[PDB]
Structure formats: C-alpha cells, structure tokens
Amino acid sequence: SPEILALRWKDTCAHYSPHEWVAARNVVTANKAALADYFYECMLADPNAAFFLSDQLVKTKLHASMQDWLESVYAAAPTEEYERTVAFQRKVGEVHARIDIPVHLVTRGACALIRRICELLDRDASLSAAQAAATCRYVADVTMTAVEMMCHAYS
Amino acid sequence: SPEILALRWKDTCAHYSPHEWVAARNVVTANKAALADYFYECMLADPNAAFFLSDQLVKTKLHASMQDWLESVYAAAPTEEYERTVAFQRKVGEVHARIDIPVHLVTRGACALIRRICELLDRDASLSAAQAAATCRYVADVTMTAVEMMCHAYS
Ligand code: HEM
Ligand code: HEM
Ligand SMILES: [C-]#N
Numbered sequence: 001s002p003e004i005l006a007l008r009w010k011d012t013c014a015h016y017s018p019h020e021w022v023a024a025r026n027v028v029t030a031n032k033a034a035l036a037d038y039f040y041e042c043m044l045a046d047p048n049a050a051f052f053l054s055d056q057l058v059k060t061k062l063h064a065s066m067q068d069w070l071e072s073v074y075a076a077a078p079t080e081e082y083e084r085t086v087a088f089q090r091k092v093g094e095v096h097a098r099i100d101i102p103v104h105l106v107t108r109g110a111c112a113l114i115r116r117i118c119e120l121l122d123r124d125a126s127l128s129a130a131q132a133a134a135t136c137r138y139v140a141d142v143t144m145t146a147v148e149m150m151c152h153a154y155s
Numbered sequence: 156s157p158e159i160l161a162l163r164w165k166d167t168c169a170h171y172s173p174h175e176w177v178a179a180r181n182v183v184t185a186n187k188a189a190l191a192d193y194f195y196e197c198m199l200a201d202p203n204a205a206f207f208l209s210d211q212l213v214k215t216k217l218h219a220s221m222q223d224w225l226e227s228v229y230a231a232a233p234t235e236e237y238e239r240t241v242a243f244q245r246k247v248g249e250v251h252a253r254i255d256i257p258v259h260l261v262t263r264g265a266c267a268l269i270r271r272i273c274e275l276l277d278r279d280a281s282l283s284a285a286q287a288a289a290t291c292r293y294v295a296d297v298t299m300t301a302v303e304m305m306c307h308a309y310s
C-alpha cells in the first residue's frame with residue numbers, strides 16, 4: 001500500500017534536516033539535464049543496456065522523464081508529497097518489470113546518479129564541509145529508497 | 156564471465172586513488188561487527204525481511220559472513236583481487252535468487268551499509284574534508300558495484 005511505503009520514505013528523510021533536502025533538490029534541479037545526459041551516456045555506451053534502449057526513445061521520451069523522475073524524488077520531502085511519490089516509483093517499477101529490464105542495470109543507473117549528484121555537491125561553494133557531507137548521505141538514502149520502491153515490481 | 160566483470164570493478168575503483176581505497180577499508184575493518192549489527196537490526200525489525208531470517212541463522216552464520224563480505228569488498232582494489240571478488244559476489248547472488256530473497260530488500264541492505272560507513276567516515280578525525288568526501292563517493296560506488304554483481308542472479 002502507498003500509505004505504508006510513504007512512512008518508509010518519510011522516516012528515511014526524517015533522519016536529515018530540511019537543509020539537506022533543499023541543498024540536494026537545488027543541485028538536482030540546476031543540473032537535471034546534465035544528470036540525464038550522464039545517465040544515458042553510461043547506458044547507451046554498454047551494449048547489454050543499449051539492448052533495451054533506442055536513441056529515438058531516449059531523445060523524445062526518457063531524457064525528459066529522467067529529469068521529471070529526479071525532480072519528483074527531491075521534491076517529495078520538502079512538499080510532503082510522500083504517498084504520490086512512492087505511487088509513481090511503484091508504477092515506474094511495473095514498466096521495467098513488464099519488459100524485463102534486468103534489475104542489476106537499474107541499480108547501476110541509481111549508482112551513476114548518486115555519484116554525479118555527490119560530485120556536484122562537493123563542488124557547491126554555497127555549502128560548508130559538514131553541510132555537503134550530510135547532503136551526500138541524504139542523496140544516497142533517498143535515491144536508494146526510490147529505487148527500492150521501483151524494485152518491488154520484480155518480486 | 157568473471158574476467159569481464161573484474162574490468163567493471165577495476166574501472167569503478169580506478170575513478171579514485173589508493174587513499175580512498177585505504178580510508179574506506181580501515182573504517183570498515185575497525186567497525187565490521189558494528190556494521191553487521193546495524194544490518195541485522197534493520198532487517199530483523201522489519202517483518203517482511205525477518206520472514207527470510209532466523210535469529211539462529213544470523214547468530215551462527217550470517218553475522219560472521221556479513222563481516223567477511225565487507226572485508227572482501229574493501230580488499231578487492233588494494234589487493235588487486237578483482238576476479239575472485241566478483242566470482243564471490245556472483246555466488247552470493249545465486250544463494251539469494253535460489254531462495255527468492257526479494258531484490259528490493261538486498262538494495263535496502265546495501266543502502267543501510269553505505270549510510271553507516273559514510274557516517275563513520277564523517278567522524279574519522281584522521282581524514283581531511285576533501286579526503287572523507289572522496290572516500291564516501293567510493294564507498295557508494297564499490298558497495299553498489301558489489302550489489303549489482305549480486306543482482307545478476309535475478310535476471
Ligand atoms: C534508476 C534507474 C532508472 C530510472 C530512474 C528510470 C526511470 C524511468 C521512468 C520514469 C520511466 C517512465 C517512462 C514512461 O514510460 O513514461 C522509465 C521507463 C523505461 N525505462 Fe527506465 N529508469 C531507470 C533504469 C532503466 C534501465 C537500466 C533501463 C534499460 C537498460 C531502462 C529502460 C526503460 C524503458 C525501455 C522504459 C520504457 C519507455 C517506454 O517504452 O515508455 N530504465 N524509466
Ligand atoms: C547487500 C545485502 C546483503 C549482503 C551483503 C548479504 C550477504 C550474504 C552472504 C555473504 C551470504 C552467504 C552466506 C552463506 O551461505 O555462506 C548470504 C546468504 C543469505 N542471505 Fe544475505 N546478504 C544480503 C541481503 C540479504 C537480505 C535482504 C536477506 C533477507 C531478508 C538475506 C538473507 C540471506 C539468507 C537467508 C542467506 C542464506 C543463509 C544460509 O541458508 O546459508 N540476505 N547473504
Ligand atoms: C529509463 N531511462
């Protein structure tokens with residue numbers, strides 16, 4: 001049930017302060033196109049992943065949907081839209097399961113996004129050392145939570 | 156093939172310097188029992204996960220195997236034992252797939268370990284701010300890589 005899954009999201013985010021939620025959301029919104037670019041560079045360059053993707057599908061649909069996915073993940077806690085976000089993650093998971101996207105590639109995708117966001121946070125001059133470190137831990141937690149809910153469809 | 160998967164591990168780690176490999180491996184070896192404790196606290200407390208675990212199995216087998224798993228992951232790059240590590244990850248994945256461990260719980264497990272290791276690195280006074288930040292990015296990369304190879308069994 002989405003109401004149950006919303007608690008898991010809420011609890012995970014409640015480990016951090018709104019300052020981490022905002023620092024993460026700002027770096028993601030300012031770089032969402034560049035994050036989509038990096039995601040599809042990594043996937044299209046591997047033939048095992050490129051097997052499931054066309055250049056047309058990524059150009060006209062997925063590049064934009066990835067940006068929307070990122071905005072949704074980092075908006076959930078600040079806008080208190082937990083139930084709606086987990087419901088969306090659930091449906092995204094159902095799409096991947098239906099067409100047999102290997103789960104190991106989804107985890108690699110999450111890994112690539114966590115890496116690039118945390119690299120961008122390290123460069124963010126507006127944040128202190130402790131602020132950035134807290135934000136990077138939150139990025140890993142919230143991205144992994146999103147991907148966990150995407151992976152419910154595989155069981 | 157493990158030789159192919161070893162390249163993926165090598166490439167992922169080659170993004171960082173030996174200083175990140177060593178800082179990560181030291182915090183993990185010094186806290187491996189405490190990391191196992193946190194892992195099994197999180198799993199045994201959730202009834203959906205506790206469904207697949209007995210207190211006896213964790214006490215007498217898995218608590219020790221989790222410590223061994225952690226040591227293996229953070230030894231691979233420093234000891235250049237890439238092929239052996241990926242081969243071990245592959246077999247660990249086969250165990251979980253055989254007994255239908257939900258993949259979403261494995262990702263949650265990886266998330267819990269990444270969080271606690273990065274929290275311990277933040278507290279490590281022997282590291283500078285940039286050193287810790289680089290090490291935390293490596294922890295997320297290498298843990299996620301290990302879990303990716305565990306998840307090959309699910310496809
Ligand atoms: C964490 C990683 C991923 C995220 C966040 C993600 C995100 C999404 C989203 C939001 C959609 C919905 C698009 C639409 O149907 O409206 C989607 C669909 C899709 N994804 Fe992913 N995805 C991920 C991993 C992957 C991987 C690894 C592959 C393949 C190698 C893949 C291939 C696809 C395909 C083929 C569709 C269906 C597009 C269409 O036919 O509608 N995705 N993904
Ligand atoms: C990233 C997460 C995980 C890691 C690193 C991990 C590690 C391992 C390792 C190294 C083994 C081999 C033990 C042995 O057979 O020699 C194992 C087996 C096993 N794991 Fe996990 N595991 C993870 C996730 C999970 C989850 C989420 C569950 C269940 C909720 C689970 C339940 C089991 C069970 C039941 C066995 C078989 C024990 C026995 O019958 O031999 N594991 N795991
Ligand atoms: C999904 N790209």
Ligand SMILES: [C-]#N
Nearest residue numbers: 217218220221
């Ligand atoms: C596997 N505990």
